[PDB]
Amino acid sequence: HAADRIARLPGQPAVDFDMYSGYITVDEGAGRSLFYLLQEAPEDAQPAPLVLWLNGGPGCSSVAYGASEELGAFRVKPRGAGLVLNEYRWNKVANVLFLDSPAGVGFSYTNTSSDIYTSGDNRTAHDSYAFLAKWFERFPHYKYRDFYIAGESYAGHYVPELSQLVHRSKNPVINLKGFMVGNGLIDDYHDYVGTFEFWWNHGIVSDDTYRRLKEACLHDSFIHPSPACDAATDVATAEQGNIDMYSLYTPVCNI
Amino acid sequence: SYDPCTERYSTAYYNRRDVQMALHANVTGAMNYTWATCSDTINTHWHDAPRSMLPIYRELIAAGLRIWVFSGDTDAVVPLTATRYSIGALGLPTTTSWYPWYDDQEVGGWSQVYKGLTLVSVRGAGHEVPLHRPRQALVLFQYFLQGKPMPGQ
Protein backbone atom coordinates (compact mmCIF):
# COMPACT_ATOMS: atom_id res chain seq x y z
CA HIS A 1 0.00 0.00 0.00
CA ALA A 2 2.52 2.63 1.22
CA ALA A 3 4.80 1.28 -1.45
CA ASP A 4 2.30 2.37 -4.11
CA ARG A 5 2.26 5.82 -2.79
CA ILE A 6 3.39 8.43 -5.31
CA ALA A 7 5.71 11.05 -4.13
CA ARG A 8 5.53 13.59 -6.92
CA LEU A 9 5.13 13.20 -10.52
CA PRO A 10 7.38 14.92 -12.93
CA GLY A 11 6.17 18.41 -13.46
CA GLN A 12 3.53 18.00 -10.85
CA PRO A 13 2.29 20.98 -8.89
CA ALA A 14 2.21 20.61 -5.16
CA VAL A 15 -1.18 19.48 -3.82
CA ASP A 16 -2.95 18.59 -0.68
CA PHE A 17 -4.02 15.06 -1.34
CA ASP A 18 -2.19 11.80 -1.90
CA MET A 19 -2.11 9.46 -4.88
CA TYR A 20 -1.09 5.85 -5.27
CA SER A 21 -0.40 3.72 -8.31
CA GLY A 22 0.86 0.29 -8.94
CA TYR A 23 -0.06 -3.27 -10.02
CA ILE A 24 -2.38 -5.98 -8.86
CA THR A 25 -2.20 -9.41 -10.29
CA VAL A 26 -5.56 -10.55 -11.42
CA ASP A 27 -4.49 -13.83 -13.01
CA GLU A 28 -1.49 -15.63 -11.64
CA GLY A 29 -1.70 -18.45 -14.19
CA ALA A 30 -1.70 -16.07 -17.15
CA GLY A 31 0.45 -13.53 -15.56
CA ARG A 32 -2.13 -10.78 -15.98
CA SER A 33 -1.66 -7.72 -13.87
CA LEU A 34 -3.66 -4.46 -13.82
CA PHE A 35 -2.21 -1.04 -13.17
CA TYR A 36 -4.25 1.48 -11.09
CA LEU A 37 -4.12 5.09 -10.19
CA LEU A 38 -5.71 6.30 -7.00
CA GLN A 39 -6.26 9.99 -6.49
CA GLU A 40 -7.57 10.78 -3.03
CA ALA A 41 -9.63 13.62 -1.68
CA PRO A 42 -8.03 16.08 0.67
CA GLU A 43 -8.49 15.53 4.38
CA ASP A 44 -11.17 18.04 4.71
CA ALA A 45 -13.30 15.83 2.53
CA GLN A 46 -12.57 12.48 4.24
CA PRO A 47 -13.70 9.85 4.70
CA ALA A 48 -15.01 10.35 1.11
CA PRO A 49 -16.45 7.65 -1.09
CA LEU A 50 -14.44 5.40 -3.18
CA VAL A 51 -15.14 5.62 -6.87
CA LEU A 52 -13.90 3.22 -9.44
CA TRP A 53 -13.70 4.99 -12.83
CA LEU A 54 -13.41 3.18 -16.11
CA ASN A 55 -12.82 4.36 -19.66
CA GLY A 56 -14.10 2.35 -22.72
CA GLY A 57 -12.86 1.67 -26.20
CA PRO A 58 -12.85 -1.17 -25.62
CA GLY A 59 -9.03 -0.95 -25.22
CA CYS A 60 -8.82 2.69 -23.91
CA SER A 61 -7.07 3.57 -20.71
CA SER A 62 -8.78 4.95 -17.60
CA VAL A 63 -5.54 6.75 -16.81
CA ALA A 64 -5.04 8.21 -20.23
CA TYR A 65 -8.58 9.66 -20.42
CA GLY A 66 -10.25 9.67 -17.16
CA ALA A 67 -7.28 10.71 -15.18
CA SER A 68 -5.40 12.73 -17.76
CA GLU A 69 -7.90 14.73 -19.80
CA GLU A 70 -11.12 14.37 -17.85
CA LEU A 71 -12.05 14.17 -14.13
CA GLY A 72 -8.48 13.44 -12.92
CA ALA A 73 -6.51 15.85 -10.73
CA PHE A 74 -4.14 16.99 -13.46
CA ARG A 75 -3.83 17.79 -17.10
CA VAL A 76 -0.67 17.27 -19.12
CA LYS A 77 1.03 20.18 -20.70
CA PRO A 78 2.00 20.24 -24.29
CA ARG A 79 4.70 18.17 -25.43
CA GLY A 80 4.11 16.14 -22.22
CA ALA A 81 6.14 18.66 -20.35
CA GLY A 82 4.46 18.73 -17.04
CA LEU A 83 1.26 19.10 -15.25
CA VAL A 84 -1.48 21.42 -14.36
CA LEU A 85 -4.06 20.98 -11.81
CA ASN A 86 -7.65 20.34 -12.83
CA GLU A 87 -9.62 22.80 -11.00
CA TYR A 88 -12.68 20.69 -11.34
CA ARG A 89 -11.04 17.35 -10.50
CA TRP A 90 -13.52 14.88 -9.10
CA ASN A 91 -11.01 14.01 -6.37
CA LYS A 92 -12.14 17.20 -4.82
CA VAL A 93 -15.07 15.14 -3.46
CA ALA A 94 -14.22 11.40 -3.80
CA ASN A 95 -11.29 8.97 -3.61
CA VAL A 96 -11.01 8.22 -7.36
CA LEU A 97 -9.64 4.94 -8.47
CA PHE A 98 -8.67 4.78 -12.12
CA LEU A 99 -8.16 1.18 -13.55
CA ASP A 100 -6.30 0.47 -16.88
CA SER A 101 -8.33 -2.44 -18.17
CA PRO A 102 -8.27 -4.99 -19.56
CA ALA A 103 -4.76 -6.42 -19.34
CA GLY A 104 -2.92 -4.91 -22.19
CA VAL A 105 -4.40 -1.52 -21.82
CA GLY A 106 -2.37 1.40 -20.62
CA PHE A 107 0.14 0.08 -18.11
CA SER A 108 -1.86 -3.09 -17.45
CA TYR A 109 -0.10 -6.14 -18.88
CA THR A 110 -0.34 -9.85 -19.59
CA ASN A 111 2.24 -12.51 -19.59
CA THR A 112 0.21 -14.50 -22.09
CA SER A 113 0.34 -12.65 -25.35
CA SER A 114 -2.67 -14.20 -26.70
CA ASP A 115 -4.58 -12.57 -23.87
CA ILE A 116 -4.60 -9.44 -25.98
CA TYR A 117 -6.30 -11.24 -28.84
CA THR A 118 -8.86 -12.87 -26.69
CA SER A 119 -10.30 -10.07 -24.62
CA GLY A 120 -14.09 -10.00 -24.00
CA ASP A 121 -16.54 -8.52 -21.62
CA ASN A 122 -16.63 -11.60 -19.36
CA ARG A 123 -12.99 -11.89 -18.58
CA THR A 124 -12.68 -8.17 -18.41
CA ALA A 125 -15.17 -8.12 -15.68
CA HIS A 126 -13.94 -11.15 -13.83
CA ASP A 127 -10.55 -9.82 -13.82
CA SER A 128 -11.82 -6.50 -12.57
CA TYR A 129 -13.59 -8.16 -9.76
CA ALA A 130 -10.43 -9.91 -8.88
CA PHE A 131 -8.58 -6.70 -9.03
CA LEU A 132 -10.93 -5.17 -6.57
CA ALA A 133 -10.92 -7.91 -4.00
CA LYS A 134 -7.23 -7.86 -4.01
CA TRP A 135 -7.01 -4.08 -4.09
CA PHE A 136 -8.98 -3.83 -0.96
CA GLU A 137 -6.69 -6.30 0.78
CA ARG A 138 -3.91 -3.93 -0.14
CA PHE A 139 -5.91 -0.84 1.09
CA PRO A 140 -7.84 -2.42 3.90
CA HIS A 141 -8.76 1.12 5.20
CA TYR A 142 -11.13 1.29 2.25
CA LYS A 143 -13.16 -1.73 3.24
CA TYR A 144 -16.70 -0.97 3.94
CA ARG A 145 -16.43 2.47 2.28
CA ASP A 146 -19.39 3.64 0.22
CA PHE A 147 -18.37 2.53 -3.13
CA TYR A 148 -19.43 3.45 -6.67
CA ILE A 149 -18.47 2.42 -10.12
CA ALA A 150 -18.57 4.87 -13.00
CA GLY A 151 -17.29 5.24 -16.69
CA GLU A 152 -18.19 6.36 -20.20
CA SER A 153 -18.64 4.95 -23.63
CA TYR A 154 -17.72 1.21 -23.85
CA ALA A 155 -17.69 1.33 -20.04
CA GLY A 156 -21.49 1.35 -20.47
CA HIS A 157 -20.68 -2.35 -20.64
CA TYR A 158 -17.92 -2.58 -18.16
CA VAL A 159 -19.59 -0.66 -15.35
CA PRO A 160 -22.92 -2.48 -15.03
CA GLU A 161 -21.16 -5.78 -15.85
CA LEU A 162 -18.78 -5.33 -12.98
CA SER A 163 -21.46 -3.95 -10.83
CA GLN A 164 -23.40 -7.06 -11.25
CA LEU A 165 -20.53 -9.32 -10.23
CA VAL A 166 -19.87 -7.18 -7.20
CA HIS A 167 -23.47 -7.20 -6.27
CA ARG A 168 -23.85 -10.81 -6.69
CA SER A 169 -20.53 -11.57 -5.13
CA LYS A 170 -21.93 -10.79 -1.74
CA ASN A 171 -18.51 -9.42 -0.80
CA PRO A 172 -18.99 -7.97 2.43
CA VAL A 173 -16.09 -5.60 2.18
CA ILE A 174 -17.24 -3.82 -0.78
CA ASN A 175 -20.09 -1.40 0.12
CA LEU A 176 -21.36 -0.94 -3.50
CA LYS A 177 -23.85 1.87 -3.53
CA GLY A 178 -24.40 2.33 -7.27
CA PHE A 179 -22.98 3.26 -10.61
CA MET A 180 -23.08 6.00 -13.15
CA VAL A 181 -22.68 5.73 -16.90
CA GLY A 182 -21.82 8.66 -19.25
CA ASN A 183 -22.45 8.47 -23.05
CA GLY A 184 -22.57 4.76 -22.76
CA LEU A 185 -23.50 1.71 -24.60
CA ILE A 186 -26.69 0.54 -23.10
CA ASP A 187 -28.62 -1.49 -25.78
CA ASP A 188 -27.34 -1.95 -29.29
CA TYR A 189 -30.56 -1.80 -31.05
CA HIS A 190 -31.84 1.35 -29.37
CA ASP A 191 -28.56 2.93 -29.34
CA TYR A 192 -28.17 2.38 -33.10
CA VAL A 193 -31.55 3.87 -33.62
CA GLY A 194 -30.94 6.97 -31.48
CA THR A 195 -27.53 7.36 -33.01
CA PHE A 196 -28.67 7.69 -36.59
CA GLU A 197 -31.58 9.88 -35.66
CA PHE A 198 -29.31 12.15 -33.74
CA TRP A 199 -26.82 12.37 -36.63
CA TRP A 200 -29.58 13.25 -39.11
CA ASN A 201 -30.89 15.83 -36.67
CA HIS A 202 -27.40 17.38 -36.47
CA GLY A 203 -26.99 17.54 -40.24
CA ILE A 204 -24.20 15.15 -40.41
CA VAL A 205 -25.52 12.58 -42.99
CA SER A 206 -27.83 12.57 -46.02
CA ASP A 207 -31.31 11.35 -45.90
CA ASP A 208 -30.39 8.33 -47.95
CA THR A 209 -27.47 7.45 -45.67
CA TYR A 210 -29.74 7.84 -42.67
CA ARG A 211 -32.04 5.31 -44.19
CA ARG A 212 -29.19 3.06 -45.36
CA LEU A 213 -27.80 3.05 -41.79
CA LYS A 214 -31.07 2.20 -40.23
CA GLU A 215 -31.60 -0.67 -42.62
CA ALA A 216 -27.96 -1.95 -42.46
CA CYS A 217 -27.23 -1.79 -38.78
CA LEU A 218 -30.27 -2.44 -36.77
CA HIS A 219 -29.82 -6.04 -35.99
CA ASP A 220 -26.08 -5.60 -35.24
CA SER A 221 -24.08 -4.71 -32.16
CA PHE A 222 -21.93 -1.55 -31.87
CA ILE A 223 -18.82 -3.57 -31.32
CA HIS A 224 -19.46 -6.12 -34.04
CA PRO A 225 -21.26 -4.50 -36.95
CA SER A 226 -22.25 -6.54 -39.99
CA PRO A 227 -20.52 -5.81 -43.28
CA ALA A 228 -23.73 -3.98 -44.48
CA CYS A 229 -23.46 -1.83 -41.37
CA ASP A 230 -19.89 -1.08 -42.08
CA ALA A 231 -20.47 -0.20 -45.72
CA ALA A 232 -23.21 2.14 -44.63
CA THR A 233 -21.04 3.75 -41.98
CA ASP A 234 -18.27 4.22 -44.47
CA VAL A 235 -20.60 6.47 -46.44
CA ALA A 236 -21.61 8.33 -43.23
CA THR A 237 -18.03 8.85 -42.56
CA ALA A 238 -17.49 10.36 -45.86
CA GLU A 239 -20.51 12.60 -45.33
CA GLN A 240 -19.28 13.62 -41.84
CA GLY A 241 -16.05 14.93 -43.14
CA ASN A 242 -13.25 16.31 -41.01
CA ILE A 243 -15.09 17.07 -37.77
CA ASP A 244 -14.63 15.72 -34.24
CA MET A 245 -17.47 13.20 -33.84
CA TYR A 246 -16.85 13.17 -30.05
CA SER A 247 -17.61 16.97 -29.90
CA LEU A 248 -19.45 18.35 -32.85
CA TYR A 249 -18.82 22.02 -32.31
CA THR A 250 -15.17 21.87 -31.34
CA PRO A 251 -12.09 21.68 -33.49
CA VAL A 252 -10.06 18.71 -34.32
CA CYS A 253 -6.45 18.62 -33.07
CA ASN A 254 -4.04 19.86 -35.84
CA ILE A 255 -0.77 18.19 -34.83
CA SER B 1 -8.57 27.39 -23.65
CA TYR B 2 -10.09 24.11 -25.04
CA ASP B 3 -7.31 22.06 -26.63
CA PRO B 4 -8.22 19.15 -28.78
CA CYS B 5 -4.63 17.69 -28.72
CA THR B 6 -4.60 16.33 -25.21
CA GLU B 7 -4.06 12.77 -26.26
CA ARG B 8 -0.75 13.75 -27.82
CA TYR B 9 0.54 15.38 -24.66
CA SER B 10 -0.51 12.46 -22.60
CA THR B 11 1.31 10.07 -24.82
CA ALA B 12 4.44 12.16 -24.57
CA TYR B 13 4.19 12.26 -20.89
CA TYR B 14 3.45 8.67 -20.06
CA ASN B 15 6.11 7.43 -22.26
CA ARG B 16 8.67 9.44 -20.10
CA ARG B 17 11.06 7.24 -17.99
CA ASP B 18 10.82 9.38 -14.96
CA VAL B 19 7.05 9.46 -15.05
CA GLN B 20 6.87 5.74 -15.08
CA MET B 21 9.32 5.72 -12.29
CA ALA B 22 7.22 8.02 -10.25
CA LEU B 23 4.15 5.88 -11.13
CA HIS B 24 5.83 2.66 -10.36
CA ALA B 25 4.89 1.54 -13.81
CA ASN B 26 6.81 -0.83 -15.95
CA VAL B 27 9.21 -1.28 -12.98
CA THR B 28 11.60 -3.54 -14.98
CA GLY B 29 11.27 -1.96 -18.44
CA ALA B 30 9.80 -5.21 -19.81
CA MET B 31 6.76 -3.58 -21.45
CA ASN B 32 8.60 -3.24 -24.70
CA TYR B 33 6.16 -1.21 -26.42
CA THR B 34 5.34 2.39 -26.36
CA TRP B 35 2.63 3.40 -23.95
CA ALA B 36 -0.54 4.42 -25.99
CA THR B 37 -3.99 5.90 -24.91
CA CYS B 38 -5.80 2.75 -26.29
CA SER B 39 -4.72 -0.62 -27.66
CA ASP B 40 -5.73 -1.05 -31.25
CA THR B 41 -5.14 -4.68 -30.91
CA ILE B 42 -7.49 -5.34 -28.20
CA ASN B 43 -9.81 -2.81 -29.78
CA THR B 44 -9.72 -4.95 -32.86
CA HIS B 45 -9.89 -8.32 -31.24
CA TRP B 46 -12.79 -8.08 -29.07
CA HIS B 47 -14.88 -10.98 -28.24
CA ASP B 48 -17.99 -11.29 -26.14
CA ALA B 49 -20.26 -8.26 -25.67
CA PRO B 50 -23.99 -8.78 -24.92
CA ARG B 51 -26.29 -6.61 -26.90
CA SER B 52 -28.24 -5.23 -24.02
CA MET B 53 -27.27 -4.07 -20.56
CA LEU B 54 -30.95 -3.56 -19.65
CA PRO B 55 -31.40 -6.74 -17.75
CA ILE B 56 -28.52 -5.81 -15.48
CA TYR B 57 -30.17 -2.54 -15.09
CA ARG B 58 -33.38 -4.20 -14.11
CA GLU B 59 -31.55 -6.39 -11.64
CA LEU B 60 -29.67 -3.63 -9.92
CA ILE B 61 -32.58 -1.35 -9.88
CA ALA B 62 -34.47 -4.05 -8.19
CA ALA B 63 -31.54 -4.57 -5.88
CA GLY B 64 -32.04 -0.92 -4.92
CA LEU B 65 -28.78 0.42 -6.22
CA ARG B 66 -28.35 4.03 -7.22
CA ILE B 67 -28.19 4.37 -10.98
CA TRP B 68 -27.52 7.48 -12.98
CA VAL B 69 -27.02 7.82 -16.64
CA PHE B 70 -25.58 10.86 -18.22
CA SER B 71 -24.86 12.30 -21.60
CA GLY B 72 -22.85 15.10 -23.11
CA ASP B 73 -25.35 16.39 -25.73
CA THR B 74 -22.86 17.42 -28.47
CA ASP B 75 -21.24 13.98 -28.74
CA ALA B 76 -22.11 12.17 -31.82
CA VAL B 77 -20.34 8.86 -31.07
CA VAL B 78 -22.75 7.54 -28.31
CA PRO B 79 -25.28 10.40 -28.49
CA LEU B 80 -28.02 11.52 -26.17
CA THR B 81 -30.70 10.18 -28.46
CA ALA B 82 -29.22 6.68 -28.29
CA THR B 83 -29.41 7.04 -24.52
CA ARG B 84 -32.97 8.39 -24.44
CA TYR B 85 -34.16 5.50 -26.47
CA SER B 86 -32.22 2.86 -24.45
CA ILE B 87 -33.42 4.05 -21.14
CA GLY B 88 -36.80 4.49 -22.65
CA ALA B 89 -36.74 0.78 -23.21
CA LEU B 90 -36.67 0.14 -19.42
CA GLY B 91 -40.07 1.47 -19.34
CA LEU B 92 -39.66 3.08 -15.96
CA PRO B 93 -42.07 5.46 -14.44
CA THR B 94 -41.30 9.02 -14.16
CA THR B 95 -41.02 10.67 -10.87
CA THR B 96 -39.70 14.01 -12.21
CA SER B 97 -40.24 14.91 -15.80
CA TRP B 98 -37.44 16.40 -18.07
CA TYR B 99 -36.34 19.68 -16.48
CA PRO B 100 -33.52 22.19 -16.86
CA TRP B 101 -30.91 22.05 -14.14
CA TYR B 102 -28.84 25.05 -13.37
CA ASP B 103 -25.31 25.78 -12.47
CA ASP B 104 -25.39 29.05 -10.97
CA GLN B 105 -27.51 31.04 -13.32
CA GLU B 106 -26.99 28.89 -16.35
CA VAL B 107 -28.81 25.85 -17.59
CA GLY B 108 -26.23 23.01 -17.28
CA GLY B 109 -28.37 20.47 -19.06
CA TRP B 110 -31.54 18.70 -18.28
CA SER B 111 -32.65 15.81 -16.23
CA GLN B 112 -35.46 13.42 -15.67
CA VAL B 113 -35.94 11.25 -12.56
CA TYR B 114 -37.54 7.90 -12.97
CA LYS B 115 -38.40 5.45 -10.42
CA GLY B 116 -35.02 3.80 -9.87
CA LEU B 117 -32.79 5.87 -12.24
CA THR B 118 -31.80 9.40 -12.92
CA LEU B 119 -31.04 10.66 -16.38
CA VAL B 120 -28.89 13.73 -16.88
CA SER B 121 -27.79 15.60 -20.03
CA VAL B 122 -24.89 17.98 -19.87
CA ARG B 123 -25.53 20.88 -22.22
CA GLY B 124 -22.90 21.58 -24.93
CA ALA B 125 -20.55 18.77 -23.65
CA GLY B 126 -19.01 16.24 -26.10
CA HIS B 127 -18.22 12.53 -25.24
CA GLU B 128 -15.72 13.45 -22.61
CA VAL B 129 -17.88 15.37 -20.41
CA PRO B 130 -15.43 16.44 -17.72
CA LEU B 131 -13.18 17.51 -20.58
CA HIS B 132 -15.75 19.83 -22.29
CA ARG B 133 -17.86 20.90 -19.36
CA PRO B 134 -15.64 20.36 -16.36
CA ARG B 135 -17.57 22.65 -14.10
CA GLN B 136 -20.91 21.09 -14.84
CA ALA B 137 -19.34 17.54 -14.79
CA LEU B 138 -18.42 18.14 -11.17
CA VAL B 139 -21.82 19.31 -10.21
CA LEU B 140 -23.20 16.18 -11.82
CA PHE B 141 -20.78 14.06 -9.83
CA GLN B 142 -21.57 15.74 -6.51
CA TYR B 143 -25.26 15.32 -6.92
CA PHE B 144 -24.99 11.67 -7.87
CA LEU B 145 -22.79 10.99 -4.76
CA GLN B 146 -25.29 12.67 -2.64
CA GLY B 147 -28.11 10.74 -4.30
CA LYS B 148 -29.80 14.16 -4.92
CA PRO B 149 -31.52 15.40 -8.09
CA MET B 150 -29.84 17.96 -10.24
CA PRO B 151 -30.72 21.31 -9.05
CA GLY B 152 -33.52 23.52 -10.71
CA GLN B 153 -32.89 27.37 -10.09
Binding site: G57, P58, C60, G184, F222 | C38, N43, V77, V78
Partner: peptide, 4 residues
Protein backbone atom coordinates in the same frame (compact mmCIF):
# COMPACT_ATOMS: atom_id res chain seq x y z
CA UNK C 1 -9.55 1.20 -35.09
CA UNK C 2 -13.74 2.42 -33.32
CA UNK C 3 -13.62 3.84 -29.93
CA UNK C 4 -16.66 4.28 -27.74
Amino acid sequence: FXLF
